[PDB]
Amino acid sequence: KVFGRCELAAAMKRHGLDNYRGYSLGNWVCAAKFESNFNTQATNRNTDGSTDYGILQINSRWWCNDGRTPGSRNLCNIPCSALLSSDITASVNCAKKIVSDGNGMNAWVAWRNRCKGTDVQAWIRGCRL
Ligand SMILES: [Cl-]
Ligand SMILES: [Cl-]
Ligand SMILES: [Cl-]
Ligand SMILES: [Cl-]
Ligand code: NA
Ligand code: NA
């Protein structure tokens, strides 16, 4: 599924991401835009052989099992393909574990490089939430 901007913000808000660990909703929408262009079916290979999956590009080295990342973990206890669903529950619940790991949203390189220090509230401007 390709979400609209405000549709994704509302979905994220209902699943409890708004101000989760102090990150206002616009941070999450900004990260999703630059990680996946709001497409739940996004996948992208990494140089180390791991793969990033779904709307928040969650990687198979640490967080999910895809059966082809040797020596990896599965800390969200899910198959990586669950992260490609039109239902974002698994992505959101796994992202809550990631953002709580110690480095906050800096775990998402694209958030650090494209969202951190910018007016992220612009990403939810105009939305009925
Ligand atoms: Cl947009
Ligand atoms: Cl914030
Ligand atoms: Cl959903
Ligand atoms: Cl933090
Ligand atoms: Na915001
Ligand atoms: Na894995």
How much distance in Å is there from the Cα of 101 to the middle of ligand 1? 28
Resolution in A: 1.4
Say if CB 111 and CB 105 are below 8 A apart.
yes
101 Cα–ligand 6 center, Å = 16
Q: Which long-range contacts (CB under 8 A, 24 or more apart) does 94-97 make?
A: 94/58, 94/63, 94/64, 95/17, 95/28, 95/56, 95/58, 96/16, 96/17, 96/20, 96/21, 97/63
For residue 73, report the distance from its CA to the centre of ligand 6, in Å. 4
Say if residue 87 carries a ligand binding annotation: no
> By what technique were these coordinates determined?
X-ray
Domains of the chain: 1-129 (1.10.530.10)
Which ligand is closest in space to the CA of residue 116? 2
Residues with catalytic roles = 35, 52
Q: Would you state the structure tokens that stand for residue 75, as one six-digit string? A: 């800390």
